[PDB]
Design a protein around this motif. Structure first.
Motif: not given
Ligand SMILES: *[C@@H]1O[C@H](CO)[C@@H](O)[C@H](O)[C@H]1NC(C)=O
Ligand SMILES: *[C@@H]1O[C@H](CO)[C@@H](O)[C@H](O)[C@H]1NC(C)=O
Length: 148
Positions: A15-17, A99
């Motif tokens: 879920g992070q970038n 992303r």
């Protein structure tokens, strides 16, 4: 010139970038650069040899082509559509931002840079870095990066 990879391992939660980066070190009008990314593997003698897709896009989908005097970024389309954006600045920074990471994004990522003058390939150089996307309890709160 050579490609430098400031970090050789990125460890990120789902879920992070993340932004992966290559930098052009050494001596760099009517010159053009071809720059792209792909996933690959550390072979026995060959690293970054075979080119595998990134989010079901290929190195042709992801590439940038620009003269020495320009910067370049990939389209808004492929960013909205696939959460990827590749960019080259005026100072030898070349990056790809991903992303909404998922576990399937893990792999060995290669940045390729080809310098072209009058249709002749003078330099072809690559850098390699690992991305590990983690799930569950031991995954960090945001990305952890390990220098090369
Ligand atoms: C990732 O980047 C997008 C912009 O494309 C932003 O809206 C989002 O908040 C970012 N996610 C995190 C976890 O920072
Ligand atoms: C990433 O996920 C967020 C939900 O947290 C969503 O709003 C956003 O549009 C997503 N971006 C992409 C490029 O899929």
């Amino acid at each position: 010139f050579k490609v430098a990879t400031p970090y050789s391992l990125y460890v990120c939660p789902e879920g992070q970038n993340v932004t992966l980066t290559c930098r052009l070190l050494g001596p760099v009008h009517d010159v053009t650069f071809y720059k792209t990314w792909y996933r690959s593997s550390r072979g026995e003698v060959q690293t970054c040899s075979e080119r595998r897709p990134i989010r079901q896009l290929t190195f042709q989908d992801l590439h940038l082509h620009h003269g020495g005097h320009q910067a370049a970024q990939t389209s808004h389309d492929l960013a909205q559509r696939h959460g990827l954006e590749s960019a080259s600045d005026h100072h030898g920074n070349f990056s790809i931002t991903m992303r909404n990471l998922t576990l399937l994004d893990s792999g060995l990522y290669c940045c390729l840079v080809v310098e072209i003058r009058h249709h002749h390939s003078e330099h072809r150089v690559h850098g390699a870095m690992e991305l590990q996307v983690q799930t569950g309890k031991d995954a960090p709160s945001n990305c952890v990066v390990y220098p090369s």
